Write an enzyme that holds these catalytic residues in place. Structure first.
Site, PDB file in Angstrom:
ATOM      1  N   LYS A  42       0.803  -1.207   0.000  1.00 46.60           N
ATOM      2  CA  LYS A  42       0.000   0.000   0.000  1.00 46.60           C
ATOM      3  C   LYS A  42       0.851   1.279   0.000  1.00 46.60           C
ATOM      4  CE  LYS A  42      -3.233  -2.818   2.635  1.00 46.60           C
ATOM      5  N   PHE A  83      13.210  -4.984   3.928  1.00 42.94           N
ATOM      6  CA  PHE A  83      14.314  -5.740   4.526  1.00 42.94           C
ATOM      7  C   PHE A  83      13.770  -6.616   5.671  1.00 42.94           C
ATOM      8  CE2 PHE A  83      16.838  -4.252   8.376  1.00 42.94           C
ATOM      9  CZ  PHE A  83      17.665  -5.338   8.529  1.00 42.94           C
ATOM     10  N   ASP A  88      11.615 -11.817   7.866  1.00 39.19           N
ATOM     11  CA  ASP A  88      10.540 -12.170   8.833  1.00 39.19           C
ATOM     12  C   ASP A  88       9.679 -13.402   8.483  1.00 39.19           C
ATOM     13  OD1 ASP A  88       8.186 -11.361  10.723  1.00 39.19           O
ATOM     14  OD2 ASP A  88       7.283 -11.609   8.711  1.00 39.19           O
ATOM     15  N   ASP A  92       9.208 -16.608  10.604  1.00 39.34           N
ATOM     16  CA  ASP A  92       7.800 -17.072  10.635  1.00 39.34           C
ATOM     17  C   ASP A  92       7.291 -18.175   9.654  1.00 39.34           C
ATOM     18  OD1 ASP A  92       7.919 -15.352  12.722  1.00 39.34           O
ATOM     19  OD2 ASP A  92       6.989 -13.623  11.759  1.00 39.34           O
ATOM     20  N   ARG A  97       3.019 -13.265   0.453  1.00 39.08           N
ATOM     21  CA  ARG A  97       3.012 -11.902   0.930  1.00 39.08           C
ATOM     22  C   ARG A  97       2.794 -10.984  -0.244  1.00 39.08           C
ATOM     23  NH1 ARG A  97       5.976 -10.496   5.569  1.00 39.08           N
ATOM     24  NH2 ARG A  97       4.144  -9.229   6.008  1.00 39.08           N
ATOM     25  N   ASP A 159       9.673 -11.303  20.186  1.00 37.02           N
ATOM     26  CA  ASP A 159       8.619 -11.938  19.427  1.00 37.02           C
ATOM     27  C   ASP A 159       8.863 -13.430  19.370  1.00 37.02           C
ATOM     28  OD1 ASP A 159       8.349 -13.438  16.922  1.00 37.02           O
ATOM     29  OD2 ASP A 159       7.043 -11.853  16.167  1.00 37.02           O
ATOM     30  N   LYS A 185       8.883  -4.136  17.952  1.00 41.16           N
ATOM     31  CA  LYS A 185       8.944  -4.764  16.633  1.00 41.16           C
ATOM     32  C   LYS A 185       8.194  -4.016  15.577  1.00 41.16           C
ATOM     33  CE  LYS A 185       5.089  -8.006  16.215  1.00 41.16           C
ATOM     34  NZ  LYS A 185       4.604  -9.345  15.882  1.00 41.16           N
ATOM     35  N   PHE A 224      -1.914  -0.796  15.399  1.00 43.98           N
ATOM     36  CA  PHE A 224      -1.692  -1.379  14.099  1.00 43.98           C
ATOM     37  C   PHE A 224      -1.194  -2.839  14.137  1.00 43.98           C
ATOM     38  CE2 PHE A 224       0.912  -2.195  10.377  1.00 43.98           C
ATOM     39  CZ  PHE A 224       0.104  -1.771   9.362  1.00 43.98           C
ATOM     40  N   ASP A 228      -3.007  -6.156  12.948  1.00 44.36           N
ATOM     41  CA  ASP A 228      -2.249  -7.159  12.180  1.00 44.36           C
ATOM     42  C   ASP A 228      -2.512  -8.568  12.728  1.00 44.36           C
ATOM     43  OD1 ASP A 228       0.040  -7.568  10.057  1.00 44.36           O
ATOM     44  OD2 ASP A 228       0.820  -8.619  11.801  1.00 44.36           O
ATOM     45  N   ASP A 229      -2.529  -8.691  14.062  1.00 47.24           N
ATOM     46  CA  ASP A 229      -2.768  -9.953  14.721  1.00 47.24           C
ATOM     47  C   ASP A 229      -4.186 -10.435  14.453  1.00 47.24           C
ATOM     48  OD1 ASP A 229      -0.264  -9.516  15.750  1.00 47.24           O
ATOM     49  OD2 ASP A 229      -0.928  -9.247  17.858  1.00 47.24           O
TER      50      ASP A 229
HETATM   51  O1  LIG Z   1       3.562  -9.126   8.156  1.00 45.51           O
HETATM   52  P1  LIG Z   1       3.521  -9.996   9.342  1.00 45.51           P
HETATM   53  O2  LIG Z   1       4.358 -11.287   9.292  1.00 45.51           O
HETATM   54  O3  LIG Z   1       2.093 -10.143   9.776  1.00 45.51           O
HETATM   55  C1  LIG Z   1       4.259  -8.959  10.645  1.00 45.51           C
HETATM   56  O4  LIG Z   1       3.382  -7.884  10.915  1.00 45.51           O
HETATM   57  C2  LIG Z   1       5.569  -8.413  10.051  1.00 45.51           C
HETATM   58  C3  LIG Z   1       6.459  -7.648  11.023  1.00 45.51           C
HETATM   59  C4  LIG Z   1       7.831  -7.726  10.831  1.00 45.51           C
HETATM   60  C5  LIG Z   1       8.674  -7.040  11.692  1.00 45.51           C
HETATM   61  C6  LIG Z   1       8.147  -6.255  12.672  1.00 45.51           C
HETATM   62  N1  LIG Z   1       6.834  -6.173  12.845  1.00 45.51           N
HETATM   63  C7  LIG Z   1       5.990  -6.829  12.038  1.00 45.51           C
HETATM   64  P2  LIG Z   1       4.407  -9.947  12.152  1.00 45.51           P
HETATM   65  O5  LIG Z   1       4.681  -9.331  13.523  1.00 45.51           O
HETATM   66  O6  LIG Z   1       5.461 -10.867  11.788  1.00 45.51           O
HETATM   67  O7  LIG Z   1       3.122 -10.673  12.240  1.00 45.51           O
HETATM   68 MG   LIG Z   2       6.023 -12.314  10.312  1.00 44.24          MG
HETATM   69 MG   LIG Z   3       1.102 -10.773  11.569  1.00 47.31          MG
HETATM   70 MG   LIG Z   4       7.238 -11.668  12.677  1.00 47.31          MG
END
Ligand SMILES: O=P(O)(O)C(O)(Cc1cccnc1)P(=O)(O)O
Ligand SMILES: [Mg+2]
Ligand SMILES: [Mg+2]
Ligand SMILES: [Mg+2]
Ligand SMILES: O=P(O)(O)C(O)(Cc1cccnc1)P(=O)(O)O
Ligand SMILES: [Mg+2]
Ligand SMILES: [Mg+2]
Ligand SMILES: [Mg+2]
Lengths: 334, 334
Positions: A42, A83, A88, A92, A97, A159, A185, A224, A228-229
């Site tokens: 976005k 990056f 990530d 994960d 993506r 995390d 994070k 935010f 995301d969660d």
């Molecule tokens: O995009 P994702 O993996 O949902 C995420 O938000 C990506 C991310 C990377 C680094 C820092 N914060 C979020 P996450 O916390 O891993 O779920």
């Molecule tokens: Mg992730």
């Molecule tokens: Mg996430």
């Molecule tokens: Mg992550």
């Protein structure tokens, strides 16, 4: 506005690739890494640099070149994000993506994408030097990007410490702990970073002003990541563009934290027996425990209450910055 | 001298860990990453910063604090190395390093070691800020570390582009190509970097002087990677402290390049049939083709000829720097 930002990307790839001769194949690879990995989102974080630049700088100082420096530092915030996401998605064990397969899941990339992520970070500082070397804010920006990189890597650390593969961590999942993770994070590099950059570009280096801006913006980023969660499990994947892995990755989700403080002892055991495992039917039991606990409804209330709280913080802390800086942001995320 | 350098490490871990509260567990993890990953080598690259600092700076300016800044920037060169090795050992699928298992092969680390490497890089710039913020050379150092990071990631890129898993690349293995890879992946950060750092610390920022120093030092690093390659197959692993993976990783080794330009057509096919595969008996055939071609003998001659050439380059290009800067280095590597 997102149209003109995305069109500037072809120029940043030109300059980043103008080092071509012996390293020809490596430049090419870097091009390919940029296109796959910086394009396709976005662009909210990078546009934010530019939007706030226009609001914070005197229009009589918005030279065509000072505007170009603004476009470039916005793209620098997007390369930071890029990056961090590439790496990530390895860590994960994510599948998609931005509507395509995670880059490292591409035939013929795999773990080479560790170099690639590292190269994306290096491009920030190549851009800052090409465009902002002689500006008074040069060192302030370098230091801000580096510091937000560190904070983000501290957050990633928690995390993951908090989410070991194949190990019931339920007791580790507190609100206290949840808030610490997302603070570091996510909140620093997605929200404070691009506003702070624009601020230094506008010669607003006052320490109490960055603090005040940060008071507001860290809570926005906290919301935010809660969003995301929530969306990792309950988001339309044709919208989000990514398959969710939180539960299988045994993660300290807003969802699980909230589940854990409402669950009956029997319900605690369903979670204990089912969380953090790669079996779809296991993931399904948890999702259904979440739906039985009415967590989509709880998220929706929290979204309402956090919004009210963020706007109260803008009342308190925005001055002497235009509130519109923070209000356009809140519009975009809620 | 290596004794006093290694003892200073306990202080850099104190300062790096003095950020402790919510991030307690992440600091701890970082400590653990530092100890496992920065400690255990020879420390040649970091000591070099300090040795050349003492040779380049007026002893009346070797304040106890300017000496401490020198110890710290040397450790910064070791954290760079450590950042690159951790990641490198994932990508190369290495087993041991510095006499212990590669950190990411440790039960309970795995790919989390991608964050960990990233954190090691971030520590460079935290150290530079704590110690060198108010020094005139602050920005020159930041820029040197960043630039040597980029160059090294360009080199890694070629290293890997040139060595795909499961794909005969023999024709790709030229001298031209070999030299380009090692130039970028090794020569910049192991040799030019620590000398250049000391130089900026001594207020020697002259562009032609860094060029001249770089002329010498890039060739030293080119030899050092040729040595690294030779020893990957022919080094006593109780000495080197690492198991070699070049052949199985299908890499553009000095050895293979040299093999390829002496092999008979039948011998080319032994290599074609056997290189870049994980079967021990396959690796063994190649090693024996190398020994049949008398490559340990060829290395030994090259070591002699490169030494003579490096010393001739010191004759030409060392002035006005003390030759002892470059001679102590050559002593250490040959
Ligand atoms: O995009 P994702 O993996 O949902 C995420 O938000 C990506 C991310 C990377 C680094 C820092 N914060 C979020 P996450 O916390 O891993 O779920
Ligand atoms: Mg992730
Ligand atoms: Mg996430
Ligand atoms: Mg992550
Ligand atoms: O230590 P290693 O893996 O022998 C090595 O020297 C490590 C290394 C990492 C990065 C740049 N240059 C060398 P490589 O080229 O991978 O063989
Ligand atoms: Mg390696
Ligand atoms: Mg390597
Ligand atoms: Mg090697």
């Amino acid at each position: 506005e997102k149209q003109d930002f995305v069109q500037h990307f072809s120029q940043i790839v030109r300059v980043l690739t103008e080092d071509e001769p012996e390293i020809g194949d490596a430049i090419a690879r870097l091009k390919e890494v940029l296109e796959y990995n910086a394009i396709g989102g976005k662009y909210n974080r990078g546009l934010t640099v530019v939007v706030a630049f226009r609001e914070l700088v005197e229009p009589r100082k918005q030279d065509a070149d000072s505007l170009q420096r603004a476009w470039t530092v916005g793209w620098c915030v997007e390369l930071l994000q890029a990056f961090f996401l590439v790496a990530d998605d390895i860590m994960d064990s994510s599948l998609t993506r931005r509507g395509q397969i995670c880059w490292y899941q591409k035939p013929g990339v795999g773990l080479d994408a560790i170099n690639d992520a590292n190269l994306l970070e290096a491009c920030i500082y190549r851009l800052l030097k090409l465009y902002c070397r002689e500006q008074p804010y040069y060192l302030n920006l370098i230091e801000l990007f580096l510091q937000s990189s560190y904070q983000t890597e501290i957050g990633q650390t928690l995390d993951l410490l908090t989410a070991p593969q194949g190990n019931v961590d339920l007791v580790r999942f507190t609100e206290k702990r949840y808030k610490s993770i997302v603070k570091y994070k996510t909140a620093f590099y997605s929200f404070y970073l691009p506003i702070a950059a624009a601020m230094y570009m506008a010669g607003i280096d006052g320490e109490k002003e960055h603090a005040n801006a940060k008071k507001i913006l860290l809570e926005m980023g906290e919301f935010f990541q809660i969003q995301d969660d929530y969306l990792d499990l309950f988001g339309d994947p044709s919208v989000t563009g990514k398959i969710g892995t939180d539960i299988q990755d045994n993660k300290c989700s807003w969802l699980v934290v909230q589940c854990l403080q409402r669950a009956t002892p029997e319900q605690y055991q369903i979670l204990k027996e089912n969380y953090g495992q790669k079996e779809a039917e296991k993931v399904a039991r948890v999702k259904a425990l979440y739906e039985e606990l009415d967590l989509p409804a709880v998220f929706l209330q929290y979204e309402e209450d956090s919004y009210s709280h963020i706007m109260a913080l803008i009342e308190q802390y925005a001055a002497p910055l235009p509130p519109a800086v923070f209000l356009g942001l809140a519009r975009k995320i809620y």
